[PDB]
Amino acid sequence: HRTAAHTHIKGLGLNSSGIAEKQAAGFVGQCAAREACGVVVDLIKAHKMAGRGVLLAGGPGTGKTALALAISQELGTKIPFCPITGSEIYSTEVKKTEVLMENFRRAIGLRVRETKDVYEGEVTEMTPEEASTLLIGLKSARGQKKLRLDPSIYEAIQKERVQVGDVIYIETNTGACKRVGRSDAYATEFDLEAEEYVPIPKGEVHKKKEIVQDVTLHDLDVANARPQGGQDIISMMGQLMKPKMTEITDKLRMEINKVVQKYINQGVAELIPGVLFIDEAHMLDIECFTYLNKALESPIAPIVVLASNRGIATIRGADDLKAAHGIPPDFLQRLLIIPTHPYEPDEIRRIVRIRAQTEGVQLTDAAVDRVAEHGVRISLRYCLQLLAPASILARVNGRTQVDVQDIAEAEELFLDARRSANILTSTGESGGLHGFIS
Amino acid sequence: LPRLIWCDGGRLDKPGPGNLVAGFRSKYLNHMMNIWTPENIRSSLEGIENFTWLRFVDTSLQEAYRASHTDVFARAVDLASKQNRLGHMQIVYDEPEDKKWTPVHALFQICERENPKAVA
Amino acid sequence: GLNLIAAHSHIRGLGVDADTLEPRPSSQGLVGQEKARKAAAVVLEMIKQGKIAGRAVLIAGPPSTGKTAIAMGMAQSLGQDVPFTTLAASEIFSLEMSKTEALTQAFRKSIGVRIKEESEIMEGEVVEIQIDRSKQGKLTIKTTDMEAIYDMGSKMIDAMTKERVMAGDIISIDKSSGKITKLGRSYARSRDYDAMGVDTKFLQCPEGELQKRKEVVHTVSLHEIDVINSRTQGFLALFSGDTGEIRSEIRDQINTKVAEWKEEGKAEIVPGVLFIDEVHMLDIECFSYINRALESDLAPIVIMASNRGVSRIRGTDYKSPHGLPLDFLDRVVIINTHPYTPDELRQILSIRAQEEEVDLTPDALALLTKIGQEAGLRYASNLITTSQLIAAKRRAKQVGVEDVQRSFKLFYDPARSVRFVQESEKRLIGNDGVVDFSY
Amino acid sequence: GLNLIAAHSHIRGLGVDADTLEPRPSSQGLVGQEKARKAAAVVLEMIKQGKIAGRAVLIAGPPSTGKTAIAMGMAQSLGQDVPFTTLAASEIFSLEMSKTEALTQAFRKSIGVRIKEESEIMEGEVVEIQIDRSTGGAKQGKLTIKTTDMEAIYDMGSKMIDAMTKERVMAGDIISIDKSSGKITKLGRSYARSRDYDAMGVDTKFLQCPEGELQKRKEVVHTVSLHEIDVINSRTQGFLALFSGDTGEIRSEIRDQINTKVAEWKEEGKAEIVPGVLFIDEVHMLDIECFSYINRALESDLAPIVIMASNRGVSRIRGTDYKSPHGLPLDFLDRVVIINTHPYTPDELRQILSIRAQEEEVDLTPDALALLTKIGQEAGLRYASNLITTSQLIAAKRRAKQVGVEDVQRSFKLFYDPARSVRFVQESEKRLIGNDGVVDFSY
Amino acid sequence: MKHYCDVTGLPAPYLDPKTRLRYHNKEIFAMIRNLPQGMGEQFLEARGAHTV
Ligand SMILES: Nc1ncnc2c1ncn2[C@@H]1O[C@H](COP(=O)(O)OP(=O)(O)O)[C@@H](O)[C@H]1O
Ligand SMILES: Nc1ncnc2c1ncn2[C@@H]1O[C@H](COP(=O)(O)OP(=O)(O)O)[C@@H](O)[C@H]1O
């Protein structure tokens, strides 16, 4: 499988008491921030609280996004985890507050369990039995079955171009059906026909499957606001017919809450409140934070995790105002704040070894030490980038493992931003022929 | 395009083997958990609930349900089969004793029950 | 259910002795703020009487002083008898429409039109249909309790045919419209079929008499009547948004007709509240519109809240109090909220601990009250739920002092966070983009 | 053909030893830049192995130092087998969609899904068709078809008769039939029947008869990007928006479904994922909102490798009022490695001008090449390369067989270089419109 | 009815217009048209087909 930046992070690495192990689940250090994220995981899995806000704060490369993605994995696949950057709010298609509101609802999940009643077979019979109800006979290699058809699923089967000898799939509970093809027992009806001959199904003609199905409250928004998919055929024209996002009213979201609650009372649906993660939260403007004050007050609302790396910085859209994190102080009162601290040299050596064995790079310990020096003196994020080039260099040098020579060559082929800033300084001297453009 | 994408469930909306989500999601989002279905509307038809107005906009629960599910072309064809009778009432129910009569089930259709065009 | 525990879930009303408007110190969830609650109670009396149009009231005060809590308390104690539109000022900046249009909508959402109606409706399960294609015919229909045969006119047979009605369908007939609706099929017919169409729904059979007749009360805002009249099926826009900038001659004609419905007693007008939260995010162009909008016979009462000191007005570059134009403040009366004393904090933390169903020890509540005094109410409130989750990891039954203390060290308050930022100046990105990633 | 000679037409690859990644001093059209070409060769290894996700490489250097040349070298050495997306940063500023949507689409174009599908296909020359119309048509019919090796009759079903009559198949037509769907494509006309084609003008081409089996299981390999799957699923004929370009801001739950669906196809073995590369030329034209998006878009397992080029010194970041190296925020440059390109020596200028002269149709005397090399040192490599075309056209007008010094000197006199044109505006300052808008029209 | 090769009994995609024999591939088509003057009719006679 592929290897992205955080793929070594498997979870928060907490004890049963919720205390962080000094190195576990791919983390090193940040024990205080991992413990605080462990309590946020409990806050999410204990379904009862709406709209609690959390801030991750600390320098670039201190692991704020490792922590948010470790939460997402302690939280499992069941619970919605909805990551965005604050930069993504600026749609050209709806106002910013609708984009936030949609992402609030993407973070709240609704789980249904269907028993899917699937029939798949060669059509043996299509007989009318009403003044309009059919009997359809279906065949597989293992037997036949006859189905009484509702007049409306019959028309669905009739809009598919189904005939006797075709192979069809039916979801008898959901009312979906598909023409799979014509059975290849008919393949010699003619020597050429424009037809897709398929073998008869070799399994049971009827199959019953338990499927746990997830949707979100935003999927319900979208489905109730406009005709969707094969309903909206004229959408193919584009221009005014495009399925544009629209500024969905609270009246709609209020009816969705009512209708969803009905299916929760009946036990058909299970509510699952989840997380909205807003990385680069300093990119939100003052009008976004103002809306988040209202949006976090509603009794259905996800837990919201912000991340910021700004010090005292101007609030976007309100140039007169400077505050810590770039978060207006008005909003900052609502948040539980976790600080993430800088790493030490030995912690960097540990993260380097974890990343190497995740990328499949084998290192000499001298190569480990030399790489770790670049994390201390330049950046942790620069250490990790060097490992993959040095692995390539080593193998074309014929070596079985990365060694100091392959690190040293990688350092020279691939500069950091500090050394390249020295080049820009020494060379942007003039408006002459070889200068960088300032 | 390969038939894996164009036919065998690389299209999210089309149900079949290898697209087990789409048939469920079609039924539940358009019918079961759908606000415009007549059984759901009929729960909200009263008081200050969200379909309270439907009593006065000259449309049935069936018509509200059709207009929410058919696209604007199909709705425009259905609109061809209909008559400007509220504009005809402006011609007929005219004297002070006619009291500008309007069907109470069409009470909110103000701007078509009265406009200059029909008189002209 | 869907209603999880939010920050204002404990606020259940304004907490005043309704005959005299004197606030009881702690009731209906509201603690303290008696002067502001009495002013809010007088505002409720203006709202409930409805005779006064277009007063504007600003609730001003520091953060976490109950400005939202008091406005929520008014919503709870005004009750669903009256419209209460809640608008964050950020919502006015639509792409679909003008700022002033977006405000014209929010104003009209806050005026109700109330109509009382007798509807006569037949609902039942279809037993059979007979047609004499010699047109005429007969419908047989049942409840659980009654059954009848009805003579159908030709147009009813056409409509029954076009709507594909068959035995075992639950149908309704609106006698006023003369229009059918297939509601579904009875659960008794679930055995008819091995496969069902996607659109089919099962129902319990109707119950009681067939031809029910009911007295119904309908409350509809002026904004809903705008959107309905904007275009041929405008009632769809009530949900999707999508109104555009509704042309003013529509609104004028609606206002004229609603005045006739009142004059004729067909309807009553129910003026309500628009609450504009964090109103300082509006700009100079908005405030200039609101000046005229308040001066109207169909204006709601407008309530608004601000926490700004002297601050720059948006859309210009001079400052003013509350962040608002003096031209606008000349139209506004002002209610000021205050910081809380330790005994008021102790009560609010207790109200929150009850709502969150957390058992604080007395020493935990004492420490948590000191934290609320030193670090602010919202921060101490956030530590209640946090301490419960930490206590549960101990399998403890009550939140102890150590659970509050561990919550305190794990989660920084704003002041401690600002210190951390100042002590980390060179490792965080400053306002000039400079940062050093080195150890 | 259609493809004319452009600035980069001489670049055929990176010019690097496949065994050691050592760059050769000149090959495949690239001269010098050896340290930079070695680093670009290591990046090609990362791309072709697919293992690593979301690396961002910056090519930093002065203008005309081969930053685009190296980018063309990488594209040419990956070939058609890998998604390569060439974005100018100016393109992100759409009116159709937000900047971050446009950046999502660019990333999604740069991951391929590779799918292998068989069809039986029938290909041959038509010997005969008969069709019976009774009179409503298509009642029955027979096709006779051959290769050089084989001949057969087929009884036809009525929808194949509709296909045959739609595509006006006649005797002598060489056709292919995709019998899994029954589209028929007229590959051509046989020469052996040329006189049957009385309606075909003399410009008509004719083929030889096909070869071998009349029916073959042809296997097709498709690559479809994640962006194409996204756009297909956006509306009833969403694929049309891959051409007209009027995609809206495609909703992220569609993309999340597709990400799940493709991971399913990968684990089932129905498809393979082919990570490509996104090239962002003039990355300094992105703003602070783009960079904070790109930060985290790189963290996905479905991130391509990204390659970026900048001419800029310490320069103002767009959308803010402060300056940073390369014009890029340090917040972003932490997740980037920089490859630096240098200015050329005179023998490298000589070689590049020679290659440019041989890619163009230009016979160049040794003294003209020496003069153009000196102009290159003094006026820059682009100006000297532009003079090659000019001198050829001057030489041709005087009917000369070679470009001589005389022709280069006409070119140098007629067309100013940037340094001479800068001097011209400084000496002509009162007659040109200045930054205060002032100008004097008088003599 | 499924189609089989008259020479080898393997599945036959093709029917020869000339001999009326069904055949598997180009190799057997080459055989079929190089048959002696009476042999195509013997291959038909195993199907009980005749053209006399
Ligand atoms: N404590 C840690 N243990 C192991 N890996 C870490 C740790 N903190 C960060 N990383 C890794 O180092 C890199 C930088 O951290 P990241 O979370 O991206 O920083 P930022 O806070 O700027 O988002 C990422 O690849 C991340 O996976
Ligand atoms: N007088 C009060 N009684 C009970 N709860 C209060 C009171 N004042 C504030 N709170 C609670 O404390 C929190 C902050 O008060 P809130 O009114 O939301 O802040 P602001 O004054 O900034 O609008 C909310 O959870 C609110 O319910």
Ligand SMILES: Nc1ncnc2c1ncn2[C@@H]1O[C@H](COP(=O)(O)OP(=O)(O)O)[C@@H](O)[C@H]1O
């Ligand atoms: N090392 C090189 N080998 C061959 N051609 C080159 C080399 N460097 C530049 N060129 C050519 O010279 C021209 C200018 O270089 P180019 O890469 O376009 O400039 P920039 O670096 O500003 O993008 C282009 O036509 C390019 O193909």
